Amino acid sequence: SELGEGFLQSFCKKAATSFFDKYGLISHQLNSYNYFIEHGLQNVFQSFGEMLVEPSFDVVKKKDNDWRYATVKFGEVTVEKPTFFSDDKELEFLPWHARLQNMTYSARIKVNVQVEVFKQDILIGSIPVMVKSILCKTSEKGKENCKKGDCAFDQGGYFVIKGAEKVFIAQEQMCTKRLWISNSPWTVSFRSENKRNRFIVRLSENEKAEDYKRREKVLTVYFLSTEIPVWLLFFALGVSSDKEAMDLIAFDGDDASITNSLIASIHVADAVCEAFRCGNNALTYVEQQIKSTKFPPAESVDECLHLYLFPGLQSLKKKARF
Amino acid sequence: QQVGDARYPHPSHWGRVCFLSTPDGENCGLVKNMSLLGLVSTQSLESVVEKLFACGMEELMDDTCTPLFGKHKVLLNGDWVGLCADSESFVAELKSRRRQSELPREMEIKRDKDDNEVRIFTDAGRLLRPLLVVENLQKLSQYPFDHLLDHGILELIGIEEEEDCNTAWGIKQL
Amino acid sequence: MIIPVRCFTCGKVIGNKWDQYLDLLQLDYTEGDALDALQLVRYCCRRMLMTHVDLIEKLLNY
Amino acid sequence: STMKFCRECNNILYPKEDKEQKILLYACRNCDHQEVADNSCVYRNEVHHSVSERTQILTDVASDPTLPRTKAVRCSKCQHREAVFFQATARGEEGMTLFFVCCNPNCGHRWRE
Amino acid sequence: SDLQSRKNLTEEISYGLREAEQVCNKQQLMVESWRDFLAVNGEDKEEDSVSDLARFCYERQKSATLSELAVSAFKDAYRDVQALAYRYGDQSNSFLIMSKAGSKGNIGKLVQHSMCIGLQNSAVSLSFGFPRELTCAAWNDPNSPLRGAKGKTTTESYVPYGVIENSFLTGLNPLESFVHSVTSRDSSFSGNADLPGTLSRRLMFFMRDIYAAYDGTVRNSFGNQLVQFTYETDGPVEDITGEALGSLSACALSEAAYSALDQPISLLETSPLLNLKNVLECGSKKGQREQTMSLYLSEYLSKKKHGFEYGSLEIKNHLEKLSFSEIVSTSMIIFSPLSPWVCHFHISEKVLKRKQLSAESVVSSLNEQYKSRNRELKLDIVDLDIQNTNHCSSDDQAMKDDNVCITVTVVEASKHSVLELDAIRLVLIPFLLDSPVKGDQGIKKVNILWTDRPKAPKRNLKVTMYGDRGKRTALLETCLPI
Ligand SMILES: [Zn+2]
Ligand SMILES: [Zn+2]
Numbered sequence A: 001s002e003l004g005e006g007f008l009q010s011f012c013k014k015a016a017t018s019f020f021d022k023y024g025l026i027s028h029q030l031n032s033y034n035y036f037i038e039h040g041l042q043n044v045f046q047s048f049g050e051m052l053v054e055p056s057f058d059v060v061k062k063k064d065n066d067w068r069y070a071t072v073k074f075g076e077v078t079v080e081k082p083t084f085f086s087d088d089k090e091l092e093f094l095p096w097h098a099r100l101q102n103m104t105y106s107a108r109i110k111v112n113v114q115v116e117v118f119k120q121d122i123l124i125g126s127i128p129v130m131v132k133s134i135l136c137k138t139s140e141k142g143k144e145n146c147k148k149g150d151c152a153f154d155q156g157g158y159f160v161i162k163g164a165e166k167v168f169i170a171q172e173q174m175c176t177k178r179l180w181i182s183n184s185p186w187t188v189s190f191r192s193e194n195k196r197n198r199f200i201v202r203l204s205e206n207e208k209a210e211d212y213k214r215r216e217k218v219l220t221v222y223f224l225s226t227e228i229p230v231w232l233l234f235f236a237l238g239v240s241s242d243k244e245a246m247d248l249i250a251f252d253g254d255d256a257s258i259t260n261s262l263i264a265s266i267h268v269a270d271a272v273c274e275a276f277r278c279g280n281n282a283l284t285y286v287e288q289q290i291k292s293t294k295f296p297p298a299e300s301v302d303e304c305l306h307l308y309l310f311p312g313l314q315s316l317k318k319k320a321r322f
Numbered sequence B: 001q002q003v004g005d006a007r008y009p010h011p012s013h014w015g016r017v018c019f020l021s022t023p024d025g026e027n028c029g030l031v032k033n034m035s036l037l038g039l040v041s042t043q044s045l046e047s048v049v050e051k052l053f054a055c056g057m058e059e060l061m062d063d064t065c066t067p068l069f070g071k072h073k074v075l076l077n078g079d080w081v082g083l084c085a086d087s088e089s090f091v092a093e094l095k096s097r098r099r100q101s102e103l104p105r106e107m108e109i110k111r112d113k114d115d116n117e118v119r120i121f122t123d124a125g126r127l128l129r130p131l132l133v134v135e136n137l138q139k140l141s142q143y144p145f146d147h148l149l150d151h152g153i154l155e156l157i158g159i160e161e162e163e164d165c166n167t168a169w170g171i172k173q174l
Numbered sequence C: 001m002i003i004p005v006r007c008f009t010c011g012k013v014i015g016n017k018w019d020q021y022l023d024l025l026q027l028d029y030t031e032g033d034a035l036d037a038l039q040l041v042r043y044c045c046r047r048m049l050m051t052h053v054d055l056i057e058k059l060l061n062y
Numbered sequence D: 001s002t003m004k005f006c007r008e009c010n011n012i013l014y015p016k017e018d019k020e021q022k023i024l025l026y027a028c029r030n031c032d033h034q035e036v037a038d039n040s041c042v043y044r045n046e047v048h049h050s051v052s053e054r055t056q057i058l059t060d061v062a063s064d065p066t067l068p069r070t071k072a073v074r075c076s077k078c079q080h081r082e083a084v085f086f087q088a089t090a091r092g093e094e095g096m097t098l099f100f101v102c103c104n105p106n107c108g109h110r111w112r113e
Numbered sequence E: 001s002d003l004q005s006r007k008n009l010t011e012e013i014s015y016g017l018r019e020a021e022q023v024c025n026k027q028q029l030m031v032e033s034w035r036d037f038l039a040v041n042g043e044d045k046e047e048d049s050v051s052d053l054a055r056f057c058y059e060r061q062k063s064a065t066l067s068e069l070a071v072s073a074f075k076d077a078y079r080d081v082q083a084l085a086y087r088y089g090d091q092s093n094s095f096l097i098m099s100k101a102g103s104k105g106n107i108g109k110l111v112q113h114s115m116c117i118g119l120q121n122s123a124v125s126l127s128f129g130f131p132r133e134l135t136c137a138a139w140n141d142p143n144s145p146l147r148g149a150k151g152k153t154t155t156e157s158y159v160p161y162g163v164i165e166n167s168f169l170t171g172l173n174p175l176e177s178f179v180h181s182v183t184s185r186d187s188s189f190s191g192n193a194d195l196p197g198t199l200s201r202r203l204m205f206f207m208r209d210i211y212a213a214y215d216g217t218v219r220n221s222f223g224n225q226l227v228q229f230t231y232e233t234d235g236p237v238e239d240i241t242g243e244a245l246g247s248l249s250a251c252a253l254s255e256a257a258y259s260a261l262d263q264p265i266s267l268l269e270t271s272p273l274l275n276l277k278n279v280l281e282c283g284s285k286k287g288q289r290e291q292t293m294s295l296y297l298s299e300y301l302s303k304k305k306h307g308f309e310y311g312s313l314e315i316k317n318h319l320e321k322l323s324f325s326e327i328v329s330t331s332m333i334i335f336s337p338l339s340p341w342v343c344h345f346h347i348s349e350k351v352l353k354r355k356q357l358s359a360e361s362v363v364s365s366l367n368e369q370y371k372s373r374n375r376e377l378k379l380d381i382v383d384l385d386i387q388n389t390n391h392c393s394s395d396d397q398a399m400k401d402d403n404v405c406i407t408v409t410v411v412e413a414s415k416h417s418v419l420e421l422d423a424i425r426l427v428l429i430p431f432l433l434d435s436p437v438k439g440d441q442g443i444k445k446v447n448i449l450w451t452d453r454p455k456a457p458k459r460n461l462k463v464t465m466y467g468d469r470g471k472r473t474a475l476l477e478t479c480l481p482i
């Protein structure tokens, strides 16, 4: 082109030097810790609700003698500066002041707690502070003030525990909110956005509910430990039609041994209840299968499929296509 | 790597981690170190859902009939949002609007014709690297990184975005 | 630390020709041409002046 | 291995057989309507072995084995041993005859019997 | 030299690394699916097997059973390439002095410095494989086995194999420095030194108590037992008396295990140390899963012309279990007014003529197997017969009349019995498609090897070729009367 070769040969040297000045050699330990103390603490104290205390274990008598119920309230998270008390005087607290003195560099947090029993600004704890951070004292300083207790070859990214300096290694884990295809067996998992809303569609043999001869590949889904058939979950909501339930599973492939497994999957679901009988007939089986566990959720099964099944797409008929 | 073939390298991390730096002994292959041009992503505070409907994407139906007549499904962060018309103009319009400092620059958008999908990831955990673009290269110690990022002569190509673009090794030779 | 007074192999004294090396490097001279004005013909006594870190200007601030 | 959809019913029919009148009558589960068979074929499959599912380079099984070698013959132009041998047909012959292919590099010779 | 001699060496390396690829491409035509190509006859699809160069490289990655003859062919075609280090360079070169004297290195550790590194193959990898012509332009998704397998497909596991033409002096590419990090990662682990440490610890006390007594024979220190009556000394001097000759024989095997060349072959051979441990572990009967036999071809066949090759192709045809699923191509349960649920098996004529079988003899081996196995089906009753026909009059397939069919009238009864589709589709169909039609039932596969110094010699010529039968009750008491 019209651009010279010697210009583009020297443009990368100016691009990388500008990259190493802005992001620096540590762009993962600080940009993920400044996000934690500014937004992570504002949801770990808010996504837990309240607490309920009621020691009436014989007969409920809340209205009779005004039994006090204990409730709490959280909010207004604020992080204080690292400060230590010395002869009734508040001074600064530098990392080299905590390294030599064999102390832990930390800062306390405080929320607003309000209780009501009839019918503030307490402390919770102290988290360790990473040096050269948004809340650390070695930030937006001058070149003459930093020459007191800081080295030129030292940078942030390490915590100051009382024993020694401890760092963090990037722990690699699996990808969430993605379809996980496994092998032996053929499970398609679905990771959780809430605490536990996993969805494991399994294609395996039907050892249960068999007459000791028909043992072929069937479609079973593991939703909240129910082992319900997939085809009855199809008629539980949305489509209400067997011929109109193949366009959601339309792939235009060769029919060799998968159509037989679909025939087995509809014949297993036809053998326990009546799928296409009525609207409130297929929901009765999942309503009695949710309650038939050791730890049941809230019994409103018409609304239980909104906050526990697919934390996502809000429409009930739109959940069948996924 | 808290744990097969994990001790052997993979062509996915081309420039992300080092395939030559590995501590020998018991941790040969599990403890890998990042490269020089390596930065992790951060979860975006703004909602990118409302900004996709004004770029050639329509909302999918909910009346459980009239299926897609060869329409690709868009995957916004693992969840469905709607259906697109074509996966050639829409993905290019989003990639041209990301360079104009409107969409968040830590977005890894990937198209594919095999799985018949469009994947858009905005979560935190992915690691990126900077790659210079050729189409905006005609815009010529006066080069800060924000001026390179905002005008669109430099972008952060993600991990899935590196599988549908040919990157020349020589910057001024190849 | 500071520039060594003698060369590590030859033995030629080079501790005094450090201020007059930075005084000639302040101009537009090349590093390969600033050593010819100090009468250094071998590459043993030139790698000391060419490759040496000045750590005392970083160590004198505190 | 076949499936049909019911008219104004939308269910999967069942391939049952009538007892008295010998005719393949298809019946659905809910509507219990009747329909004759226009194909008379309830199964179709391109059946293969399928004994190794994603176990090609992870298991020591072999779908197509290698051809054996012998070192008792000498080729004409190459004058070398270690030639392979098998049995095949050539342009129509009752039975199979022995073949030979010189496995030596840069030789390229193959003679019948 | 100064000029043009490096260019001649480069232009010769680039032509010797393009002929060693065509040598390896010739060896992949020794597959039994290519038996119709190596015959003396004109073909029409012969241009499709010589033009496809990326397909023959893609076939070397997956299905690691022909990739053991694609490494040994490159290792035999590279001997004419490693011999270029004697025409080039003077005799006063400091590498050829230390290589010819055997001090440090050999001729293999010089051609990687000067001309080319060679080939790179590992033991086992997964989901990625290196293509041919590894450059910057070969980084596309569908036409390379790194990202996507193919377009048409079970290719989840790969065994990589690549050849690099750049040496250690010209400079490696970023992909060629990645192949060299994938391949040389097996020699970086350190969790294998315990395996020659636990072997010689259990091998120790089995010989550490055997000494040499004053009677001229060895002994055992526990119960004064006799291991052998005479020590097997090659020298005629009887000076080994009183010393522990087993304690210097256990370390004699420990020294051959600590210095074992632990560079493993890819998938066929395991290790030179694991092959030593599997011989040393004699009584450790881990299981009877795979037992291999030996059938020496020592008979009267040598008097006739080409007797061994004709004798080793009848045992291979009589002791190889060929299932019925490898012959059929279309199964169809057809309603026909005996039970009205009969099934068909359309047999191709070429696929039956290639296996040396006939349509009139394929029903006899099925009847002789269904008669002796009438205790494993669902409804074992009368009237179970298999017939044969020449044209299946139906509406399923109408390709041609050159495919014979065998109608199978299923078992019926004039009483209360079952004739359901779920019974005829689950236990009857996988029984006929798994019954043998040629050979035995317990034999997995047979191989024809050729060894120069085999076990169990003739004891009164040349080197013989023998069969290698592999079984899956007894072992030799059931392979004999079959
Ligand atoms: Zn000197
Ligand atoms: Zn109906």
Ligand SMILES: [Zn+2]
Binding pocket: E344, E345, E346, E392, E405, E406
């Ligand atoms: Zn037929």
